[PDB]
Amino acid sequence: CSVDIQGNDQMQFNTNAITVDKSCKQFTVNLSHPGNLPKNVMGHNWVLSTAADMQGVVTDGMASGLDKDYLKPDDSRVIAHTKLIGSGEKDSVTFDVSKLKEGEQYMFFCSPHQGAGMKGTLTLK
C-alpha cells in the first residue's frame, strides 16, 4: 500500500503507471528527487486527480505560481498531493483509498511539468 517515486533533472518520473491494491485502506506515495537542481529551477510535486480534472488542476496550479507550490489553494479537484521538492528533498502523502471509485480514470502528475509529459495513470486493482 505504498510506492516510492522519483522525479529527476529531466522532468521524468520513474514510473508512469501506479496500481493501488483495492484491499488497501490507505495508500502512500514517497516522492524524492535525484539529481542536482534546486526547487526554484526544477521542482517537482506529485498530484492526483481524475483524468477529466487534470488539465484544470495544471492550468490553475501553474497560474498560482512557485510560492503556492504550483497548486490552486484549496483545490477541490486534487484528491491528494505532496509539496514541491528540489534535488535531495523528499515528501510523502497518504490518502484514503475510499477516495477512489471503481470505473473512474485517475491521473498523477507534477503540476509545473505535466505539460512537458511528467504524468501517468493511477488504477485500482
Query: Per the annotation, where are the binding residues for Cu cation?
Result: 44
**How many residues are there in the chain?**
125
Sign of the CA dihedral with 28 first, then 77, 15, and 35 last: negative
Residue indicated by cell numbers 503507471? 17
Cβ nearer to Cu ion, comparing 24 with 35? 35
Within 30-49, which residues bind Cu ion (CB under 5 A)?
A: 44
Closest distance between Cu ion and the C-beta of residue 121, in Å? 17
**72 is a site residue for Cu ion (CB under 5 A):** no
* Helices and strands, number each (H, E), in the chain: 2, 8
Please, what is the minimum distance in Å from the beta carbon of residue 70 to Cu ion?
Answer: 9
C-alpha 75/C-alpha 81 separation (Å) is 11
Nearer to Cu ion, 24 or 115 (CB): 115
Residue ranges binding Cu ion (CB under 5 A):
44, 110, 113, 118
